[PDB]
Design a protein around this ligand. Structure first.
Ligand SMILES: [Zn+2]
Length: 423
């Protein structure tokens, strides 16, 4: 195992990503030299081209296409107060065309992440221009540098245009920065190693229904650690490039957090799981899709947000089914937890209550028991939904979920039934 899984996996992951980290660090050193803004943006553009070429070979043209297309659309509507609408429509078109299989499936899937981040960045800049957070429409070099920020191009977290400009302005290289990068890299490598070695072999070492749930859980936990690897790597790359900082009370804190594994592995609620899964993505979907879809109602906005999330990850039927089930699961858990908190004056909300909340029962045994029951239900939902990601169409999804006897959906139905009845 020591030289059988750990070392090969660590080599596999650290090997390819090394170049990306190198360019992030190079960008960071180059952006502290006091170069003009134009030069900084152009430099990161060239770095983004080289990183995209390194990860996707000649097939980087699709991302290049999207980048130019989004700028073209933004430029054509540079005076319109509905820039986010036009950019979202053009992203919709491009994504749908790609999902229509016009491009090779292997090639398309290979760069779903980079294209997702570019699309999220373009839509976010359009909506920030609409709401007035960004004063003027950016120059071509600033927009292209924002899309090709080398710390946020391949697996990078979505960052706002203002966050990108703050990264451009630069910050002094400090011990705190290096500790953040090192911690993120170590956690990324650990999560990758866990995903490949610890995760898959959890229950056999570390075909009844119990066996099926064990296999489902280990496939879910392996998928989670793979996602955590991507999240921590994204934190490492973004911090190493100079972004992801919070200038709070004239005190700089490099605290960009993409994923919170402890809040998903040990979950209080499925809402917490979804939020902690990818904080940049959750924020993006919440601010640039959910708030714009509030005119359809709250539940319809939840469905629109999850459908946009399904399109951003690429339309595969298992992931679309997972996100459609997650909308109902999170909503039902949320409402039931809320109503239980109201009726039972307890701190059993989907998030932790503040220290000044009106709930009478705050630390009792019943509150801990209810939170543990909902956390076990959340782990159960995670194993159910993550069973689809073992190492895929409608038939696979149906059969695989039938192997688990549709337990989560019945449980979701029961929670929903309970919610309506008690109120
Ligand atoms: Zn409370």
């Amino acid at each position: 195992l020591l030289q059988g899984c750990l070392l090969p996996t660590a080599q596999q992951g650290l090997d390819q990503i090394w170049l990306l980290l190198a360019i992030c660090l190079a960008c960071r050193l180059l952006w502290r030299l006091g170069l003009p803004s134009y030069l900084k943006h152009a430099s990161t553009v060239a770095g983004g081209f080289f990183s995209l070429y390194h990860f996707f070979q000649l097939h980087m043209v699709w991302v290049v296409l999207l980048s130019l297309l989004c700028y073209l659309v933004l430029f054509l509507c540079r005076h319109s107060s509905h820039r986010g609408v036009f950019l979202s429509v053009t992203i919709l078109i491009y994504l749908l065309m790609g999902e229509m299989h016009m491009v090779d499936t292997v090639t398309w899937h290979k760069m779903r992440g980079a294209q997702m981040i570019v699309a999220m960045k373009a839509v976010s800049l359009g909506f920030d221009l609409d709401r007035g957070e960004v004063g003027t429409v950016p120059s071509p070099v600033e927009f292209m540098g924002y899309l090709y920020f080398v710390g946020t191009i391949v697996f990078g977290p979505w960052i706002s245009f203002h966050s990108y400009l703050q990264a451009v302005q630069g910050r002094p290289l400090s011990a705190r920065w290096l500790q953040k990068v090192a911690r993120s890299l170590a956690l990324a490598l650990l999560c990758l190693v866990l995903s490949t070695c610890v995760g898959p072999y959890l229950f056999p070492y570390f075909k009844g229904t119990m066996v099926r749930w064990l296999r489902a859980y280990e496939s879910a936990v392996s998928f989670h650690f793979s996602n955590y690897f991507v999240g921590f790597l994204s934190e490492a790359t973004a911090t190493l490039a100079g972004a992801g900082f919070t200038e709070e009370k004239d005190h700089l804190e490099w605290d960009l957090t993409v994923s919170k594994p402890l809040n998903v592995e040990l979950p209080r609620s499925m809402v917490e799981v979804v939020t902690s899964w990818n904080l940049p993505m959750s924020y993006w979907l919440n601010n640039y899709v959910f708030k714009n879809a509030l005119r359809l109602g709250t539940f319809s906005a939840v469905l629109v947000t999850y459908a946009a999330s399904a399109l951003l990850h690429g339309f595969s039927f298992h992931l679309a089914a997972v996100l459609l089930s997650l909308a109902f699961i999170t909503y039902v858990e949320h409402v039931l937890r809320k109503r239980l908190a109201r009726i039972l004056s307890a701190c059993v909300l989907s998030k932790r209550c503040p220290p000044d909340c009106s709930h009478q029962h705050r630390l009792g045994l019943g509150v801990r028991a209810l939170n543990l029951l909902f956390g076990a239900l959340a782990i159960f939902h995670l194993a159910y939904l993550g069973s689809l990601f073992d190492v895929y169409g409608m038939a696979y999804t149906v059969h695989k979920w039938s192997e688990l006897s549709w337990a989560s959906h019945w449980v979701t139905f029961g929670c929903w039934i309970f919610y309506r009845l008690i109120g």
